[PDB]
Amino acid sequence: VKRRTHNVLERQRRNELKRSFFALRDQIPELENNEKAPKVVILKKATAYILSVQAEEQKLISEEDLLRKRREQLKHKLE
Amino acid sequence: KARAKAKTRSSRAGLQFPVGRVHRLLRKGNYSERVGAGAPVYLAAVLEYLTAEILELAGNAARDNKKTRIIPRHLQLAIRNDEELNKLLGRVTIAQGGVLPNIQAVLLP
Amino acid sequence: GKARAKAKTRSSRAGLQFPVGRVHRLLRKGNYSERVGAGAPVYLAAVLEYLTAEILELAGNAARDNKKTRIIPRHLQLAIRNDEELNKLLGRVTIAQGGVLPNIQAVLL
Amino acid sequence: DKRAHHNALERKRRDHIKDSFHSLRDSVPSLQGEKASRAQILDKATEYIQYMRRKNHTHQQDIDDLKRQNALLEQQVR
Amino acid sequence: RKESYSIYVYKVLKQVHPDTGISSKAMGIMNSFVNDIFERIAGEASRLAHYNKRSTITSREIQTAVRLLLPGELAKHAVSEGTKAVTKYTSA
Amino acid sequence: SRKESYSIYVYKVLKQVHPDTGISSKAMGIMNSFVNDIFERIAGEASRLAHYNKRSTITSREIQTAVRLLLPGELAKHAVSEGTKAVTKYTSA
Amino acid sequence: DIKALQKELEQFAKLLKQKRITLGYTQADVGLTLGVLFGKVFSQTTICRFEALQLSFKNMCKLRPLLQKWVEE
Amino acid sequence: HRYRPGTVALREIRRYQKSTELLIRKLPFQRLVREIAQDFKTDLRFQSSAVMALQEACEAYLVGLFEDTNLCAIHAKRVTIMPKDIQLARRIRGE
Amino acid sequence: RYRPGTVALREIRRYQKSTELLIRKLPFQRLVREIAQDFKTDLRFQSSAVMALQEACEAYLVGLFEDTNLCAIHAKRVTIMPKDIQLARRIRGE
Amino acid sequence: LRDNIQGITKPAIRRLARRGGVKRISGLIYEETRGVLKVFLENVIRDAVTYTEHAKRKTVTAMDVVYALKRQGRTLYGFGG
Amino acid sequence: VLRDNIQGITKPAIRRLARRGGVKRISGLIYEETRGVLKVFLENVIRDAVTYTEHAKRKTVTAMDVVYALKRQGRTLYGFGG
DNA sequence: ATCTGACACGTGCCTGGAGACTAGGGAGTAATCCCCTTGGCGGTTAAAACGCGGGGGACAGCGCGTACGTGCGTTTAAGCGGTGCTAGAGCTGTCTACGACGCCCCACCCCGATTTGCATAACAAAG
DNA sequence: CTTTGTTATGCAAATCGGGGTGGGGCGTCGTAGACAGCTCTAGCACCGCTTAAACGCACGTACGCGCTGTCCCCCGCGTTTTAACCGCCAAGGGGATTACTCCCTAGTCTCCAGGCACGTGTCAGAT
């Protein structure tokens, strides 16, 4: 009975993990159509996707900082 | 709190902080020969309370600056703009905390 | 150090006046560590005696300067505050009935 | 032969997945430097991407806003 | 492997500000904070036990240490919260 | 009921340094507190050093280190020499 | 007989005072001289109290032998 | 005959620096200590040695404050000490 | 040209708002190594140990300057002088 | 008990100032000084009482004062400890 | 063998620190006085950090040795450890 | 034909925590005694309180004069990215010298008399 | 008036002895750390290029400093008054102690599950 309990809990744990894989898979545009994407690909491309998005944040914040500096200089000129 | 339904000691106390870890830490460092069963529970509750108090203020500071993330600047403001925390942590240097924007009137036009 | 000792007392073996056995006991009762090395209380007793001698020597000189044959709290205060190393060590210490140094500034005259 | 080879192929498959989990785990600040289950890594990556998506959208909004403010100030300056 | 409270800080922050994150530098600061407060209270409780010739640290020594260490309202609230947590734990 | 003190040892040190000089009871009470304060400071520092290095035994090395930290300047230098001398002679046959 | 002992000690103390005055010595000088003779250098207070009979009979009995040598010297 | 102003002040400074006795009378000090203690908790008792310990610390504290207060007044190129000098000394000290 | 003090106030607001270190890193490292060299030769430092020193040092000097500024104001001056630093350190007990 | 702060008279304040090397005292010092002393006593007494209550004692002892002062960085010698 | 790297602290660096402190005007004698104060501060912190390092029989000074050196002086630093 | 990679099933497997007792020690409780705190009372006198007159220092205003701030052009080295090298930080395994701990006996320390000088003050003389 | 030694005595401190205990051997044993070895992290030395920050100098002027003058308000002194202090007394309460007793944590062991990876079945697209 304990063996059976372990078997089903582990069987469900795999299915729960698969659902977590799908939740991540569906969230990455690169894997949007890849319904059969394997676990290894999802993790590798999720990593690459997040890193590229983080790189985008660094680009965006740099532009924001430059624009804030420009705003202050323009106000100074008006004064 | 209203109820408890858990095996975990931290959950029984209704705390997020790890009671079992605090218990081990109280034994470490030779603070005493013996530690009371309720000792780590009381202490964990205090650590959590103070932690929540700082985070709440720091989060408010983040909103004031239109930020979605807490940074060391916010922690510095949260503490230095609060008399009780300022007394408790008045000797503490916070990395990249900065300083309050205080300028004396005699220096102004 | 001393060439030899005949007394069984550990303090005598070390050539010290301060009680090694008591220092050893206190280190074990204060829960400073799980274990205390045999040479630990010997080293410490020597340090306590050395510092004690330095204060007493200066205080004794202060007593002689005041034409007194007995050391009083006033002399201890003078002994510490007129010595840079001791004044740094005990700078925050308040000595009962020690009084203060007779410091007169030129701006007062 | 074939079974032992299959075992080796399966071991390699798992090893790639395990390393990929670690790389993904270190990509999310909530798990960076911390122990995490396989499921937690996936769940944090999922919400973190959603966070970063709206965060970068928010950054672009601030960029557009500052650009428009600068355009107005430049118009006043000229 | 090293121990930290970052996982618990994350949970507390989520409960207080569900839509606010925390930087890694801020997290390092929060860990320094928790370790500092722990040492202060544990050290003070040890002193109190020593002064009263006691060998066991209980909620009374910790409560006293809190009253001594925390100022103003923080001491009042920390004591109330500590007492409440122990009461619940005892009945849980 | 017995109350322990170092007054006898403080007295003996004074007797060796200034044999013709007496000491008041108030001065003695001060010297007794002095000894207890220094003892606690060194023992406390030694405890911290053992903890920081995750060691469980306090030896002359921790105390010597504590002395170097606690005492300034020459005073530290002399205290270390005296401590080293006492231990060396103590363990020597 | 304690009273007989008291009288003997009183008689010595009176003779001691007479000797000190006759020789032109101070009470301090007596104590200093005893220091030379025995190594025990008494203050004027002990000598004064002896002459004034402020000391106990036991103390006078114990110090007397030293003072007797002083009288002879 | 009369002394020039400041002659006595110097005499008193030298006299009080030389002496070691308490300057605050004990009885009114006790009343002050008891009044404060009654606010924290009622029906408290004190040992006479506890009161002496408090007074010794208090006088040492106030004198140290006056020494720093005096320095502030000197820095301001003044002889007379004002509340500004006390408040500055405390603010720099971190009280 | 702006009236003198106009820029200084702008800089005060700028530096109080910002959190970055004001002392250049390489010059500081050389100073730390120069001093450490007098205690023991051939010492090495973790890069984080250097940052820890910079943070403590700037926080220390800035706090000292704030107290120094108060001394100058008490003296009814705007400009800070060595006299004000020495007083602040004397009161602190340095 | 009420208003025993007046037990600290001007001469007592002046004498303390004399040890400090003060030649001249403004009239506002006396009130400021009393305010400062009251705060100092409250901080020391509050802690000494806290120790006393913790120990389940009805009386404050010198050691409670010494511990209260020790925590404030003001070590006191000669009263025991 | 390093010499005279105290000059690595330039006037602008001192000016910026003073400005953060709210200082509006700086005497020309401040720069030299400031360097003297900083040197002393570093000597005290480094001496302890090195002492901790030597006690551990290490040759490398770690961040924790600096943290302990600072904590010991009543100046607790957060973010570099505890 | 079979190879590679993938999902998924059987089943041990590490560790982390909580659960369950269990003996021996600490802490709680009750009784009792005696030192020390609180409180009161009367006398006396040292210190605080109060008024006042004078003079010394706080403070406002004025005028220099020079040291400091602000641009502006030019120089310097900080900072960033990249390369290569190895000292030593950090971990693990072996094994012994060393400190905890139990037990016993006497020389050394505590405390209560008990003796005995220290500092200050009354009692005379001397230029 | 100022200076000085003689002796008086109140009282704090140095000395003595008797007895109780904790320091020091002595043996035993478990383990903390001393020491050797090995991996591989990150600290250091070097290089070239970019460019922001640092440096030197001209030029005004805002602010520090010295002086004058006025006037508030603090000091010193005399005279009155007011509580501090000192000596003595008794009441009782609470702090220290000793003897029980019970309950509570260090210690050891048991065991349950929750993520984790070894090993096996298999199933379709690719060599």
Author numbering:
A (entry chain M): 354 to 432
B (entry chain G): 9 to 117
C (entry chain C): 8 to 116
D (entry chain N): 23 to 100
E (entry chain H): 33 to 124
F (entry chain D): 32 to 124
G (entry chain K): 138 to 210
H (entry chain E): 39 to 133
What does the paper say about this structure?
We focused on two structurally and evolutionarily distinct bHLH members from the bHLH-LZ and bHLH-PAS clades, represented by the proliferation regulator MYC-MAX and the circadian TF CLOCK-BMAL1, respectively. Structural studies with engineered or native nucleosome sequences show that MYC-MAX or CLOCK-BMAL1 triggers the release of DNA from histones to gain access.
Therefore, we constructed a nucleosome with an E-box at a solvent-facing position (SHL−6.9) highly enriched for MYC-MAX binding in our SeEN-seq assay, together with an additional OCT4 site (SHL−6.0) downstream of this E-box, maintaining a second more internal E-box at SHL+5.1 from the original W601 template. To examine how MYC-MAX accesses this internal, histone-facing E-box at SHL+5.1 together with OCT4, we determined a 3.3-Å structure of the nucleosome complex bound to OCT4 and MYC-MAX with a local resolution of MYC-MAX of 4-11 Å. On the other end of the nucleosome, we detected MYC-MAX bound to the internal E-box at SHL+5.1. Instead, we observed that the MYC-MAX dimer at SHL+5.1 engaged in extended interactions with histones H2B (around 280 Å2), H2A (around 180 Å2) and H3 (around 100 Å2), concomitant with an approximately 30-bp release of DNA from the nucleosome. The MYC-MAX bHLH-LZ fold covers large parts of the histones H2A, H2B and H3 surface orphaned by DNA release. The arginine anchor residues contacting the minor groove of the wrapped nucleosomal DNA (for example, H2A:Arg77 at SHL+5.5) are repurposed in the presence of MYC-MAX to engage the LZ. The MAX LZ facing the histones best accounts for the detailed density envelope for MYC-MAX (model map correlation, 0.59). The increased overall destabilization of the nucleosomal DNA structure by OCT4 in DNaseI experiments, in conjunction with the extensive peeling off of the DNA, suggests a mechanism in which OCT4 primes nucleosomal templates for the required DNA distortions to accommodate MYC-MAX at an internal site.
